[PDB]
Design a binder for this molecule. Structure first.
Ligand SMILES: Cc1ccccc1CNC(=O)[C@H]1N(C(=O)[C@@H](O)[C@H](Cc2ccccc2)NC(=O)c2cccc(O)c2C)CSC1(C)C
Length: 327
């Protein structure tokens, strides 16, 4: 279908960006499509933070569809906070264009050390309205609306590394991406793309958790409590300075990660969470799991899942589809 296709391109590590232009002159920007935030921002030219130094900056004169706002405002992401001011210009996603409301970022340092360390300029959120600061209607909701796409949904198709290329699709399920039949889960709320699921990490488990599907992060997380029990099981090693738990890859005895719907069951093998350390030899591994304390029953599923499962987000259907991806 007229299904806009956005190419996610990954970068040495394992995080992906996508092209993004704002305005008549079509200034280009490496963003981050994220189902965890619900805003959009681009480091504005009127920024001078070191961060911005080596970064694509947005400049407004240059266009004339730039409508002015200047209302000052900020966002406090999990790993930092940003400051600037709303602006409204033309935001375009390859095939599709659109006049939208975004934040012109001025003061970063903070998202910092991060912000420079990462091959990215901005973030385009893909969450629900209530998750956004300033109550802004999720683009996809608001293309569907202007009837410029079939329906309100987006798909995240994820591959691997050397292998191939990520693919964000807006407006339709493309079977070119998955294997088997799709199963869905209905959102427990319209904030994040959160759904109710029963969760086992191998042996240690938690029932009726709140799980959410975060295209933005590259990790999988869970309440620390829940981890401790798990980590201790397979004797993991947390070296202070390094921020990841390491462990033997060939671990005779390798648990999978269970995610149970009433009548669906989603699993994640040990290979979809682990990474050699060290790139010469597969003795030690780095895990993609980390203890974070959002709530007491809140988990987060980032790339690691979507690498395996082609995922579908349906605004109207007020739900999310799951299915195994093509390779
Ligand atoms: C997984 C995790 C947990 C806690 C802190 C950081 C991270 C890693 N975050 C990431 O990889 C990236 N982000 C993401 O993946 C985002 O989806 C982030 C995920 C999240 C959800 C609930 C609690 C805390 C964080 N969410 C938010 O930042 C967030 C969530 C709710 C409201 C809101 O105004 C924001 C900005 C935000 S930018 C980022 C590059 C930091």
């Amino acid at each position: 279908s007229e299904n806009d296709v956005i190419e996610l391109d990954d970068v040495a590590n394992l995080m992906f960006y996508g092209e993004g232009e704002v305005g008549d002159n079509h200034q280009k920007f490496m963003l981050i499509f994220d189902t965890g935030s619900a805003n959009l921002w681009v480091p504005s030219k009127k920024c001078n933070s070191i961060g911005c130094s080596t970064k694509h900056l947005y400049d407004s004169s240059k266009s004339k569809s730039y409508e002015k706002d200047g209302t000052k405002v900020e966002i406090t992401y999990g790993s930092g906070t940003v400051r600037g001011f709303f602006s409204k210009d033309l935001v375009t996603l390859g095939y599709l264009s659109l006049p939208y409301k975004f934040i012109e970022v001025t003061d970063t340092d903070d998202l910092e050390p991060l912000y420079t360390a990462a091959e990215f300029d901005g973030i385009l959120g893909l969450g629900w309205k209530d998750l956004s600061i300033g109550s802004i209607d999720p683009i996809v909701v608001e293309l569907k609306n202007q009837n410029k796409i079939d329906q309100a949904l987006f798909t995240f198709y994820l591959p691997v590394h050397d292998k191939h290329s990520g693919y964000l699709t807006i407006g339709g399920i493309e079977e070119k991406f998955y294997e088997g039949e799709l199963t869905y889960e209905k959102l427990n709320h319209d904030l994040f793309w959160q759904v109710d699921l029963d969760v086992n990490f191998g042996k240690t488990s938690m029932e009726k958790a709140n799980v959410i599907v975060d295209s933005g992060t590259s990790t999988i997380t869970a309440p620390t409590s829940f981890i401790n029990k798990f980590f201790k099981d397979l004797n993991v090693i947390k070296v202070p300075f390094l921020p990841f738990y390491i462990t033997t890859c060939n671990n005779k005895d390798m648990p999978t990660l269970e995610f149970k719907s009433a009548n669906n069951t989603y699993t994640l093998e040990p290979e979809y969470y682990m990474e050699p350390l060290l790139d010469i030899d597969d003795t030690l591994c780095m895990l993609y799991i980390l203890p974070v304390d959002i709530d007491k029953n809140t988990f987060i599923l980032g790339d690691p899942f979507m690498r395996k499962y082609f995922t579908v987000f349906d605004y109207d259907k007020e739900s999310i589809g799951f299915a195994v991806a093509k390779n």
